């Protein structure tokens, strides 16, 4: 990296303690239907700021070989991928791919219902501002399986998708849109994705009365094939790093409210019962 700009790019791509927000690459296979492309466009519109788009046709079957997916992730620094596909067996498929260290961590297929699908443009409402993260609601009994399953991985993937940029503070004017995923434990269960805008009304109390209006897109999914993580790779990915601004707690050492370092001492209970006083001549009767 002789160039300072290339050095900056390398430092941006370098591993960090506090990671960058994840980037999602949107790409399609050699055959991909118009409904699948519309679904991909709606997801990209929800995630514009941290996404890149491919426009060519890629001869990739991810559950057979993902070498090209790993190459694309390493080239574009994208750790989330949305892959569109179509077939006779699978007419409308979105494959969510999550990667770790430019290798496939896990993969999940979503089968889209074409008849119930509605785009964002099919609702005449004011839409979400660009870059605004929405609130999230996950509903139903399908997301509390004791063993990790397709619905648990789908919840994790959708959280990583609609996560946005983390922040310690949020404006109260930035709570106007909610994304609701509903799925019930059971012939296959249906994972339903809906987006709503939020209106508040006076209710006579301090808390306002919430009302919702549909925003789009309307999506019905059936969970399909699954690629589970290796346990060692999963442990590596689920490790959490401590920031330097997280103090390692020392015994008996603390900080007071003025910033002074304070140490605590422990005297113990005074037990003078085992002390014999001096048998003085003036006390000996």
């Amino acid at each position: 990296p002789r160039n300072a700009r290339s050095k900056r790019a390398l430092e941006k791509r370098a591993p960090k303690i506090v990671e960058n927000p994840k980037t999602c690459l949107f790409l399609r296979g050699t055959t991909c239907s118009q409904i699948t492309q519309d679904a991909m466009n709606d997801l990209y519109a929800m995630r514009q700021v941290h996404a890149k788009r491919f426009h060519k046709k890629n001869a990739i079957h991810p559950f057979e070989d993902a070498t090209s997916l790993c190459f694309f992730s390493e080239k574009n620094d994208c750790s989330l991928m949305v892959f569109g596909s179509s077939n006779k067996k699978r007419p409308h498929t979105l494959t969510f791919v999550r990667m770790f260290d430019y290798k496939v961590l896990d993969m999940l297929e979503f089968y889209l219902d074409p008849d119930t699908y509605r785009s964002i443009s099919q609702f005449k409402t004011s839409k979400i501002p660009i870059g605004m993260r929405p609130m999230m609601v996950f509903a139903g009994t399908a997301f509390e399986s004791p063993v990790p399953n397709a619905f648990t991985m789908a919840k994790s993937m959708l959280i990583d998708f609609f996560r946005g940029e983390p922040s310690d503070k949020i404006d109260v004017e930035g709570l106007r849109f909610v994304v609701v995923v509903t799925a019930d434990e059971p012939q296959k269960p249906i994972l339903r994705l809906r987006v709503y805008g939020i209106r508040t009304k006076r209710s006579g109390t301090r808390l306002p009365r919430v009302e919702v209006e549909e925003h789009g897109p309307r999506m019905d999914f059936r969970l399909g094939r699954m690629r589970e993580p290796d346990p060692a790779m999963l442990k590596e990915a689920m490790k959490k790093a401590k920031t330097p601004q997280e103090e390692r707690t020392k015994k008996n050492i603390s900080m007071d409210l003025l910033g002074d370092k304070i140490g605590r001492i422990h005297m113990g209970k005074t037990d003078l019962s085992k002390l014999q006083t001096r048998k003085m001549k003036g006390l000996k009767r």
Binding site: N252, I265, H266, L272, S273, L275, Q276, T277, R278, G282
Partner: protein, 188 residues
């Protein structure tokens, strides 16, 4: 005087009271005085003795806690201050388990400072006794506190009434097997 200097100028130094010669008082009175002094500073009860000490393990534990709190430094230094003849050198000897500092009932036995290695990271510094100057302290008060040698004072009979006031009469009668005096001159 020294407490005010320590509070004003060196608040980072840790002041610890040590009540010595607790074998000369009733234990209930020693506990009451400990409860009074611990409102201001942490207080350790101690009988200073090489052979038969009291409070030695507790004081060692407190110094160990201070050493752990200052584990970044190479050591902690613990300076012993107080009045003459209160038992500073005796406390150093009791903590060491060996006669390392000179001990006498003569006030002013220790004249210069002395470094004693208690453990690898703990030093003890013996100091001569100090008498903070007060305009309300009388020579009789200093003599009864033990500041001076009584061999070098003129007219020692004048301080006997203060001793007779301080000591209960039956205690003196039992000490000297003597009774029936009406004043200090006839007692002497």
């Amino acid at each position: 005087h020294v407490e005010k200097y320590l509070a004003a100028e060196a608040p980072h130094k840790h002041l610890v009271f040590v009540l010595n010669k607790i074998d000369l008082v009733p234990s209930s009175q020693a506990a009451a005085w400990i409860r009074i002094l611990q409102k201001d500073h942490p207080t350790c009860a101690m009988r200073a003795s090489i052979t038969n000490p009291f409070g030695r393990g507790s004081l060692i534990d407190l110094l160990r806690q201070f050493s752990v709190l200052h584990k970044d430094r190479k050591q902690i230094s613990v300076g012993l201050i107080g009045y003459p003849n209160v038992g500073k050198s005796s406390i150093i000897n009791a903590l060491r388990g060996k006669a390392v500092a000179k001990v006498a009932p003569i006030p002013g036995e220790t004249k210069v400072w002395q470094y004693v290695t208690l453990m690898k990271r703990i030093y003890l510094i013996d100091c001569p006794g100090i008498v903070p100057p007060n305009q309300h302290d009388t020579p009789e008060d200093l003599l009864l506190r033990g500041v001076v040698r009584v061999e070098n004072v003129e007219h020692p009979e004048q301080y006997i009434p203060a001793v007779l006031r301080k000591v209960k009469q039956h205690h003196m009668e039992r000490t000297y097997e003597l009774r029936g005096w009406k004043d200090h001159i006839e007692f002497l």
